[PDB]
Design a protein around this ligand. Structure first.
Ligand code: BIG
Ligand code: BIG
Ligand code: CL
Ligand code: CL
Lengths: 232, 232
């Protein structure tokens, strides 16, 4: 009747397929703004699941729709990412403590890379949700890292860009949607958690690795997300 | 009572200051999602004016809010841009026939630059609004070009990037918001017009030129936008 409403996002269909299957409930499909929102009831929560499509514009739009049109009270993102640090290996999980838009460049006006006037380089996520993930991971004896995630509108697959992301932002992983999702949530005062499982190492072999591990890594993230929702 | 609702967007405050002044009516300030929406009544139309803040995430969010929360029926963007072609000089106006996100790169998977799965490289704008602009420009004896506008999250100020935009996309101008605004409008079936006045030539001197001409070029675009609204 007055159930908590939880938005759950992936970027690609492959990132939400395992989520829908794992919850195992019926969903109503609601189209809006070129996205399909799957609305169901799971453990006395209304869960709204969608894939945004790839990149920052897609993810910004879908997040905004989820908040303004569906009234979600928290947003959890689940999907895959490229690893930027040697201690994050294929299949490993992390939650973003902060996000950055790594491809923003207003250096022509002496702004630091990632910075836009009237905004900030780094976007924060929900301490409470991140602490819940840490609690669950320890109880399940699963490793879970915390760190900075870099988002941009390029698939990163070069040693040079990888090193830039580490040197400039101290990022632990790279993807194409988290910062936009967290940014929108922040603007609307909605708690946000960005969870990723490593699919590749963001180098010259990344396309290969991503193709090999998308399905498995997406499933690993999906399983963990469900375990979080179970305690919300 | 049942007036047409028109959304009007700039990216920076400087792009909307002349718009608000030129309409010359009282506006109610309504904050939402970190933007301020100026709502007024002008010639029996409800006009909703806002600056998005710079770049693709900001502009996507503001456009989505304008449509979902304010119910606007058309969106007109007005502001400044860098020229990519010698026949577009400082202060000259153009309307975007199509827009592209010039910084999107999924070439690791052999996708063409600008392309994202389940989307398209080029986003269309409103033929009807573009034709209105052309009609007015001819009646006012003002030059008005039509062409492709490239949008990305970098201020472009190098000969190399400028040449890339021309060779890859046949773009006539560069900015940081038009494609995201047009993209959102398209997804919601809302007619969109992107109008820009040249502030710089998108080369190594662009920062200088932009600083010099922002105010004047913004005013030129604002004046033209008002002339369009007068005939809506
Ligand atoms: C199907 C063809 C296009 C695939 S583009 C990659 C997907 C997976 N997402 C995360 C992602 C994993 N590895 C990455 C990397 N190396 N760089 C940047 N993002 C990532 C972002 C985007 O939604
Ligand atoms: C105040 C410091 C930051 C200014 S960033 C430039 C503004 C003006 N907009 C259009 C614009 C004109 N010239 C351009 C160029 N050469 N490259 C890309 N965009 C442009 C985009 C953005 O909203
Ligand atoms: Cl069910
Ligand atoms: Cl008035």
């Amino acid at each position: 009747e007055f159930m908590q409403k939880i938005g759950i996002l992936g970027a690609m269909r492959e990132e939400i397929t395992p989520i829908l299957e794992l919850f195992g409930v019926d969903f109503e499909e609601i189209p809006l703004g070129g996205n399909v929102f799957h609305k169901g009831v799971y453990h006395n929560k209304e869960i709204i699941v969608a894939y945004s499509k790839i990149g920052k514009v897609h993810s910004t739009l879908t997040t905004t729709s989820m908040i303004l049109a569906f009234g979600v009270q928290k947003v959890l993102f689940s999907g895959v990412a490229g690893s930027l640090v040697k201690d994050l290996k294929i299949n490993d999980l992390l939650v973003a403590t902060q996000l950055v838009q790594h491809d923003v460049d207003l250096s022509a006006f002496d702004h630091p890379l990632g910075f836009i006037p009237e905004s900030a380089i780094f976007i924060e996520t929900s301490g409470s949700l991140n602490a819940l993930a840490k609690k669950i991971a320890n109880e399940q004896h699963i490793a879970l890292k915390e760190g900075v995630i870099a988002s941009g509108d390029q698939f990163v697959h070069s040693k040079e860009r990888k090193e830039f992301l580490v040197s400039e932002f101290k990022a632990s992983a790279v993807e194409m949607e988290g910062a936009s999702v967290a940014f929108v949530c922040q603007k609307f005062g909605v708690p946000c958690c960005v969870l990723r499982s490593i699919s590749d190492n963001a180098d010259e072999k990344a396309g290969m690795s991503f193709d090999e591990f998308l399905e498995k890594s997406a499933h690993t993230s999906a399983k963990f997300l469900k375990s979080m929702v179970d305690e919300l």
